[PDB]
Amino acid sequence: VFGGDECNINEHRSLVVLFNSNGFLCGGTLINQDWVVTAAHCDSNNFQLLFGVHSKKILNEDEQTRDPKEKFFCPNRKKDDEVDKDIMLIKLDSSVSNSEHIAPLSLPSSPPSVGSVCRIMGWGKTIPTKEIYPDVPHCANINILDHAVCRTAYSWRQVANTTLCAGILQGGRDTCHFDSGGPLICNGIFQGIVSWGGHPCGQPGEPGVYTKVFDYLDWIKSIIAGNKDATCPP
Amino acid sequence: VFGGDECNINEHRSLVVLFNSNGFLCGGTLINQDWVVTAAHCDSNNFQLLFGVHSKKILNEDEQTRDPKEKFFCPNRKKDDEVDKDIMLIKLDSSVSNSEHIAPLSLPSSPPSVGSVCRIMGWGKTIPTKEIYPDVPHCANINILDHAVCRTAYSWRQVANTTLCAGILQGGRDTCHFDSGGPLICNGIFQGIVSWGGHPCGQPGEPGVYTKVFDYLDWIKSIIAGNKDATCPP
Ligand SMILES: *C[C@@](*)(O)[C@H](CCCNC(N)=[NH2+])NC(=O)CNC(=O)[C@@H](N)CCC(=O)O
Ligand SMILES: *C[C@@](*)(O)[C@H](CCCNC(N)=[NH2+])NC(=O)CNC(=O)[C@@H](N)CCC(=O)O
Structure with a gap:
């Protein structure tokens, strides 16, 4: 993270x-x-x-x-x-x-609204380019973004609708390699599963795509x- | 081992x-x-x-x-x-x-006899020279030797009487670095603690010195x- x-x-x-x-x-x-x-x-x-x-x-x-x-x-x-x-x-x-x-973790009853604050967590890369991994898991808050931001950020491929587009618009915080499978949690609810994103992670304008559990x-x-x-x- | x-x-x-x-x-x-x-x-x-x-x-x-x-x-x-x-x-x-x-493992009720066959075990070196370590513990049977073999073999320091001299006379079997602290078991009885020996383990004529539990x-x-x-x- x-x-x-x-x-x-x-x-x-x-x-x-x-x-x-x-x-x-x-x-x-x-x-x-x-x-x-x-x-x-x-x-x-x-x-x-x-x-x-x-x-x-x-x-x-x-x-x-x-x-x-x-x-x-x-x-x-x-x-x-x-x-x-x-x-x-x-x-x-x-x-x-x-x-x-x-x-x-409890399953969601309803989906997260665009703009909600959520938590990402994992033992994946902490430096975008270096192969340096933590000893303890890292946690960071990111926001739920409008799905179009992702659709347009990754225009060369299709970003399914059964996914959440999350992160920070100017980058600086994002899940990275080896963070996959981890939960995206919003208000204590299980909302997404870390799936994929940019190269490297954390670049501005390239949010992460999470499988929408709901x-x-x-x-x-x-x-x-x-x-x-x-x-x-x- | x-x-x-x-x-x-x-x-x-x-x-x-x-x-x-x-x-x-x-x-x-x-x-x-x-x-x-x-x-x-x-x-x-x-x-x-x-x-x-x-x-x-x-x-x-x-x-x-x-x-x-x-x-x-x-x-x-x-x-x-x-x-x-x-x-x-x-x-x-x-x-x-x-x-x-x-x-x-049970504490001993009597000390082992000379010539007894005992099991040694641990995750220590398996090849005396190479800093290569096992993934699973290695076991081997050695014999309790006459304490004097150790006494003379290590004439350059003093071997205490509260220790067992065990190994194989011609070498080829011994405990090694990182094998310390493990048990010496003779007939299911806990008889010794791996302590020290020669550099490197296995040399002919230089047995292992174990702390005598009894x-x-x-x-x-x-x-x-x-x-x-x-x-x-x-
Ligand atoms: C399996 C899991 O460890 C990764 C997670 C990468 C998350 N990246 C970002 N920026 N949040 N996923 C992949 O290895 C799969 N990659 C792809 O499918 C590529 N099309 C996108 C590259 C990427 O995921 O960063
Ligand atoms: C701490 C423990 O892992 C080792 C075990 C060495 C056993 N060696 C043999 N050949 N069975 N013990 C030591 O590192 C302590 N070494 C000494 O006290 C030296 N006087 C001898 C070096 C040696 O044990 O090989």
């Missing part, structure tokens, strides 16, 4: 870490005691999920680890476009219970209730 | 890992649910202890992390001698319960029971 500060140790109790033998992959969001939401582009053959993490060097006495038992993607997702319908549900091999540094509510609940044939919003 | 193979995932449940911000420090041994025994030269201002660990890449789901609440050393220990009375007792800040990959039984029991003045055997 570019333009932020170290997150408070208690302000990110729902942030999950996806990693494998090759290291850190992405972030994720725990929505209930058995499921994790993250980005579809973060998928890997094998990986594990780590809960309750703050510092990577100085561990928390309450971290939990689980393996993905099931993974779900939109049935109607475009094969070639890696960020098309960037959402993946992970059914844990074993339930995770609340603790001092672990807790789920548009996928029916999908999420259907998959979680047991219906696996649930198709996503086009 | 030089000269062995990867340990079976279930044959090292008492093996603890001491680490800090600078990384890995040493091995250790869980003797009951509240105490860990290790070498005194493994001390560091700040460190933590990890239980139920095997592979550093693929984590077990039952791992536990605790912090050192109290540390204890022999009152009558030599100031400038890093390996004199090489034993340290650590009281955990919170109890550790048994699980698939965590279980304590000789400290009283100090250990007195310390754990409450007598913080208990003195060690000279």
Whole structure:
């Protein structure tokens, strides 16, 4: 996260870490005691999920680890476009219970209004060009922008409507590489999933695009209730 | 460990890992649910202890992390001698319960005999010259040798009587740097603590010198029971 500060140790109790033998992959969001939401582009053959993490060097006495038992993607997702319908549900091999540094995030009831202030968080790049990563996750506030700003900022490709356009108009704060899958939270509600953006991040006039969780509510609940044939919003 | 193979995932449940911000420090041994025994030269201002660990890449789901609440050393220990009375007792800040990959090891009732076959284990060097470290702990069987082999082999310093001389005579098997603090187990009994040896491990004729647990039984029991003045055997 570019333009932020170290997150408070208690302000990110729902942030999950996806990693494998090759290291850190992405972030994720725990929505209930058995499921994790993250980005579809973060998928890997094998990986594990780590809960309750703050510092990577100085561990928390309450971290939990689980393996993905099931993974779900939109049935109607475009094969070639890696960020098309960037959402993946992970059914844990074993339930995770609340603790001092672990807790789920509630799904939204309604979508965020243009201009609302939201929180982004992750262990991704903090310097736009350098491959320097934090030890603790960084937090920064950004605003919900008019979707047209993004549509026009990235005219060479199509910015789906099932996405939120967020950031700071003059740049300086934005999610970056390895921040993917993490939550965009507005007023304590789970509103978006970090998906993609500019090169590098934080440039003025190039906001980030987040999967709009709300548009996928029916999908999420259907998959979680047991219906696996649930198709996503086009 | 030089000269062995990867340990079976279930044959090292008492093996603890001491680490800090600078990384890995040493091995250790869980003797009951509240105490860990290790070498005194493994001390560091700040460190933590990890239980139920095997592979550093693929984590077990039952791992536990605790912090050192109290540390204890022999009152009558030599100031400038890093390996004199090489034993340290650590009281955990919170109890550790048994699980698939965590279980304590029992204190000895009698000292091992010369010629006994014992298991050594740890994440220390596997090739004497190369600064290459295992991902999973390596185990190997060595024999308890006549204490005099050590006495003469290391005629350039003095080998205490409160230690076990163990290894293979022609070399090719020994503990190495970063293997310290781990346990020497003979017939399932906790008999020694990895302390020191020659440069580099495995040289023919230069066995490993381990802290003889049996000789400290009283100090250990007195310390754990409450007598913080208990003195060690000279
Ligand atoms: C998977 C995740 O780690 C990244 C997140 C990048 C976020 N970038 C900004 N500026 N907020 N996403 C990608 O690697 C995917 N990239 C693309 O799909 C490109 N078309 C856009 C480049 C980009 O995401 O920055
Ligand atoms: C702290 C612990 O990891 C090591 C273990 C070395 C074991 N070596 C062999 N060959 N089994 N201990 C030390 O680094 C302490 N070293 C000494 O006290 C030196 N007098 C000997 C160096 C040595 O142990 O190789």
